[PDB]
C-alpha cells in the first residue's frame, strides 16, 4: 500500500515526463524524416519541401512550450511527505471478562 501511493505520486510525475518526452520525440520525427528527404529529392523539389518543412515547423512548434509543469499546475497532494504513525504491538489477551 506504500507502493500504491508511491505509484500515485510517481506515475503522475512520470506521465509528465512521458508527455515532455512525446513532444521532443516528435521534433526528432521531423528531423530524421527530413534527412531522408535530402537524399531522395532532385534539387527542384528540395527547395519546395524546404518551404513546407519550414512552414510545418513554424505552425506546429512555433510558439512557446504549452505544457507548463509547475507545482501550481500539479494537484494539491504534490506537497506533503506521507506521514507515518502507529504501532504493531504483539501482546497477550486479557484473561478476565
Amino acid at each position: 500500500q506504500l507502493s500504491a501511493m508511491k505509484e500515485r505520486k510517481t506515475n503522475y510525475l512520470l506521465a509528465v515526463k512521458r508527455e515532455l518526452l512525446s513532444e521532443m520525440l516528435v521534433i526528432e520525427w521531423m528531423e530524421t524524416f527530413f534527412a531522408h528527404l535530402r537524399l531522395s529529392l532532385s534539387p527542384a523539389e528540395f527547395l519546395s519541401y524546404k518551404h513546407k518543412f519550414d512552414l510545418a515547423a513554424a505552425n506546429i512548434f512555433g510558439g512557446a512550450v504549452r505544457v507548463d509543469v509547475d507545482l501550481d499546475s500539479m494537484p494539491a497532494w504534490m506537497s506533503e511527505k506521507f506521514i507515518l504513525q502507529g504501532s504493531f504491538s504483539v501482546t497477550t489477551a486479557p484473561y478476565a471478562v
Partner: peptide, 12 residues
C-alpha cells in the same frame, strides 16, 4: 497532511 486535516475535522 491534508488527510490529517480531514481526520481532525471529524475528531476533536
Amino acid at each position: 497532511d491534508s488527510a490529517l486535516r480531514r481526520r481532525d475535522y471529524v475528531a476533536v
